[PDB]
Write a protein that binds this ligand. Sequence first.
Ligand SMILES: [Zn+2]
Ligand SMILES: [Zn+2]
Lengths: 56, 64, 131, 165, 153, 112, 45, 263, 394
Amino acid sequence: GNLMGKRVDFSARTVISGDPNLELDQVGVPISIAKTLSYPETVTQYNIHRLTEYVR
Amino acid sequence: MIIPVRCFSCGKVVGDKWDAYLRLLEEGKQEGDALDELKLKRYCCRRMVLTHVDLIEKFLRYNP
Amino acid sequence: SSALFDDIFTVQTVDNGRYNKVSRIIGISTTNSAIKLTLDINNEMFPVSQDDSLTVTLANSLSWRPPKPTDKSLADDYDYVMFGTVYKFEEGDEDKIKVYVSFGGLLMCLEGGYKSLASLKQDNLYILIRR
Amino acid sequence: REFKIFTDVGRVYRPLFIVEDDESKDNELRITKEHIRKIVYGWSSLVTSGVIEYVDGEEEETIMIAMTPEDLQLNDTAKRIKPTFTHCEIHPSMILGVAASIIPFPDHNQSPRNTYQSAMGKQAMGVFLTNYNVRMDTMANILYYPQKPLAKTQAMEYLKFRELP
Amino acid sequence: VPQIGDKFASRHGQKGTIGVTYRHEDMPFSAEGIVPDLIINPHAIPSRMTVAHLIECLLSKVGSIRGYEGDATPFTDLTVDAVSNLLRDNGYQSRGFEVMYNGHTGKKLMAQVFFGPTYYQRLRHMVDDKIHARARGPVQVLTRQPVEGRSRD
Amino acid sequence: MNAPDRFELFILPDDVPKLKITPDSRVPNCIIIKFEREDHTLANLLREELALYPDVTFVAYKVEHPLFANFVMRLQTEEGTRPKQALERACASIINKLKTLDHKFNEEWNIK
Amino acid sequence: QKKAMSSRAGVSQVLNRYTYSSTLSHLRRTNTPIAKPRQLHNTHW
Amino acid sequence: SKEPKVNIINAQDDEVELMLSDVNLSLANSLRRTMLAEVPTLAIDLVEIKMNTSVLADEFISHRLGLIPLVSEDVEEMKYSRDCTCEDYCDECSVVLELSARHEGETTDVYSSSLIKVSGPGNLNVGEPVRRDDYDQGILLCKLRNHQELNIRCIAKKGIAKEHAKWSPCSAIAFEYDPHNKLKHTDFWFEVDAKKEWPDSKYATWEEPPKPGEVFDYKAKPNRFYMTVETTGSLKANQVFSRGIKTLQEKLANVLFELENSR
Amino acid sequence: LHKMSMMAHRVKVMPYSTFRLNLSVTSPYNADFDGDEMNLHVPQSEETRAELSQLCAVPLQIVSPQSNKPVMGIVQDTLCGVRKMTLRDTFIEYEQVMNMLFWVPSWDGVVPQPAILKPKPLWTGKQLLSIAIPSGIHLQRTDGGNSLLSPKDNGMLIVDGKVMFGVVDKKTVGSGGGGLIHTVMREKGPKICAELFGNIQKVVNYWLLHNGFSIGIGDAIADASTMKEITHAISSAKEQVQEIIYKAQHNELELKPGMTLRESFEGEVSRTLNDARDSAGRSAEMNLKDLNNVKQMVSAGSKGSFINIAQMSACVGQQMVEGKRIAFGFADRSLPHFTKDDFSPESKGFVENSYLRGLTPQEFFFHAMAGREGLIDTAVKTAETGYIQRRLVK
Ligand SMILES: [Zn+2]
Ligand SMILES: [Zn+2]
């Protein structure tokens, strides 16, 4: 219950509904959720510009 | 739970027709016709009143 | 810049095999008694009944320009013009040949044996019909 | 050659009509259109007059019950094909409980489906009582504007459904 | 308020949730003017086999136009052929069906549709009571792993 | 809860253009126009009146995705003829048609 | 009560109040303590 | 007369049946939805409830009033309070109304007639609780018992059907064309005979039947369209067509303006 | 329980509180929208991502290793409609033929020569649908009576990525062996094929969007005379039973080797009622023209089969549990409304009625007891298979 399978962080779950205008491999994600889950991306002189917008 | 201003389906008003209806019943003993005369043609706006369940009446018998 | 077929046939029969708006017709040639023809057609757009005299022609020539060519060439001196491609070249014994032509969803079959140097193996093929 | 007698407390029972051959001029239901229009006359009298009996599952074993009162005592090629009597069924649509009782024409759907709605019903929204405005209960939902169905069962008339859609 | 996710269903095991929501214009409609409030897919009929739904629809399409209350009770003497004639007496197609024009172009639909009023219950289980997302939140005590239930984050 | 504010289907937000025109490399004399805050109402109307002007070699439109009220229109015309004009005219023609309609609806009306 | 849980749980629940017909059903409900019992017998008619 | 032509049919105060001929379907449909969705109207948007002993909740009532049809004659000469350079709202951009209803007679009813119009109209017929009721009090809001009070205050604003359904003055609109399927833009369902099994439409009386001996005309396109524009009140059905034609124009205007700005 | 029960997808932020997933990827997880919920996990390393795209990407999953065949095809609306859209009777004019190529993201930017020019220039579905199919895609079929001029428009032939003849459905675009999908992955690659979906979709849905489609009770009624033609195939079958019950209540029947006289009694009633219903429906099947929607949805291969139609328009059939017709829970009888030892079909569970006609009480009951059995294991084999599974895994 806790070792061979455990509850983990960085995870989400909601209600599904299909969309006939989304590429096979896509997945429309609710704004709310995107505003919750993060991703540790190191700072680099190639994406700093884009990052500096995102941060403000 | 009171009558619904404008019918969901098409949009046509239906607030006024209430007292009118409950009368054309008690006395004139109509349904189909009353409605027809009330100017309620197509089933879309129609179903609203004839399916309305005026709960408010029992609620009003409550104190506050 | 020449013709590759010219012949009047006669409707042996008209089949509307479960098609409310299309009918598959067949007909033999008036010249040789070896050249047969099988062709699906829009009975709605171009009606046709049993026993009719139609003249079939072919060849490839005169993005996709819209109309406007009214004051340009007009090899449309007919009443039915489909476009499509041809696939197989079959040989029914002897030196008798028979090509199968499909027009983007519309089938057609030709039979005989005298286009051993006329009906090519390219994709090109434009159908024509009159009267 | 035995006689089972049960007085017990916890025996499920249903009601049925009595037939009795009291016709010395042929071969007929004891009940008449006079009992009907008469309906100090409760349901207890409807039983105190020998017009209905309570048949438990055990007693059932040794009786013969007739379905439709009428018929069981040419046709249109559209309607459904229909296939000594001792008792009759008050009405077949009474073998249902709350769930199925609200389903229109359950005899036209795949039975296992009816069984689903039979559960989902217990999970819809509407109005569950009227005093609701004075209840301090955790969780409760009221549908803004309710609506009694356009099609109904005669049985609904007893489920006050028209007043609580 | 009903949202593009809330669950619903009729009285025939035909449960379903909202996939999108259109307005009056975008919506398909009938010459008469009348327009639908709901559009469910024909595919939810063949294997579900629930036919009474289709019937509940018809009957209810009559009581609507006729103003008379519609009896649906079990084994009575009412048939689809009978109802169909009564609906033909009122003016509309004997099977319910009506012509519709695609709300976007106005052009008719090459096909016809089973347009008719049917009862629908709004079952609970609305999205905003399920939607849950976490990234390093309240940790359990004994284990020190996360905690159970969306309610406790 | 997660749905945008209704008024985002027509009001343009801080520096954003209604129209965006891009040249097409695929074939000569062609463009793809991105329309912001719009739908079939105005779309289909422009598309139509272009197959009337026999000077238009192509005219199609599409809705990227239904959640966003926008749409792209791709048009291609004959040699040395700018689509914008044919769009203007046929658009004016609409107004004329409508100017006429209005008028034709007023005289018609008056007779009551 | 006591160190005596050797009873049966299920009996007495929290009456449904989602809808009227829900509540109704709940009171008119029967249980049955534990492939053959689960069957729908004839006698159930 | 010439190119497009109008042909009004039976019209009243709360309807305008009519025939639109010599026009492309595309444009009919386009116009269709414009009435249904993009015509300026005027509905309550902000409600500052003061007292309410009704059995109905606040936002339950708030909803109700939002749909009630208000006057919209000179609706075109006003601006959204949000665009108005006044913080929040004002007479020059909003219309305020009051409502107090106290239950004294130990069932008292609340009809829409009891609304005053305390704010500044900027001197133009508009923002008035459109009454077409014979007596003068259309749409009974609600009833109340013994000592139940109720004090409101409504504020109305512009807006359109897009922004909310509580706006659109349309409410159902008929549309049909070629009742006798001659263009064959449809394939009728049937068991034996299409013609008999498929109800003739009341619009079928204004056009001649197909007539078999004639082959299928193909080069023909969808011309002439039989409609019907129902109204709820607020704007005269005619304006509800003009303003549409105009709003569409206003759009068509910016479509020409924005254009220049891209030159 | 699948390798495909977890796959990496591209994120697309959209409004509204719900996960928006593609249709074609429904059956792998085996989900529906009747309330189902879905779990989502979010990666964390720079390498983790690569690992997600290099091994868990949706395109790589297109071909399931268990049955060396795909596991994602075209479902419902898109499938159902593509069939219609394909038929020879399906024609489309410029106005729509334009808005369709535009809808294809992959369009080469070249309008194909019209299949018709003569008076009015029209096109057919078969044509446009091909613009979604990449060049070099060569497909050959040959079903049953299939030969270079398919009468009923059967079989399927695609060369260079252009449809020559035949209708497209479950058989041709399903999770099958020859499957057009299976070939595009193998011939063109993962990416292109994954995209191929989006195209084929957008196109079909659009067409259907304009062509419309529905279903209603009418699609379930059999001809006026057919409802009669069936009746006497049940009457005669009833007597063809009464005959063998008489011929059994006389010991005038032999025990089918290995079986008991009782078992052998069963063995015939079952094969009699089954074969009756079997043709009962088949009578209606060929009585339902090629326009009947329910039929269409069976030819398309998008839902239900003969059996379904049968049980809804003709005879539901005989009910059964544990392999044998309704037992005798009540001493020597099915129900108390019957004379004892009644071996007939109205007692052993034979629903002679169609859903369209609305079953009798008895029939209605039996039917449930049959279904009741289904739900049972459906609430046991659901996790016991999973039990049986867990071991196999472990
Ligand atoms: Zn309505
Ligand atoms: Zn202001």
